[PDB]
């Protein structure tokens, strides 16, 4: 925006390997160093655009310096590598999705 305040956005608390089962509640939260951060999520090398995506079922939640990614429904196909990238820092995680009994 206008000339006011700029700077890199370092990831205080990045993502971490999560072990869940198909059909559960997954919440990928991340702590940043700036509230209004333009953090971008990437899966298997795909920029998770923030536009009309009827296909997807996940919801975006911005709580200031924290970005959560709820997954109403998760499946084995959802298991990948969520690489978080920002204008200051980046990270990666491994979502382990296993089948139910």
UniProtKB/Swiss-Prot annotation:
Residues 8-100 form the Ig-like C2-type domain. Thick filament-associated protein located in the crossbridge region of vertebrate striated muscle a bands. In vitro it binds MHC, F-actin and native thin filaments, and modifies the activity of actin-activated myosin ATPase. It may modulate muscle contraction or may play a more structural role. Belongs to the immunoglobulin superfamily. MyBP family. This is Myosin-binding protein C, fast-type. It comes from Homo sapiens (Human). The lineage of its organism: Eukaryota, Metazoa, Chordata, Craniata, Vertebrata. The gene is MYBPC2. The chain holds residues 345 to 438 of 1141 of the full protein.
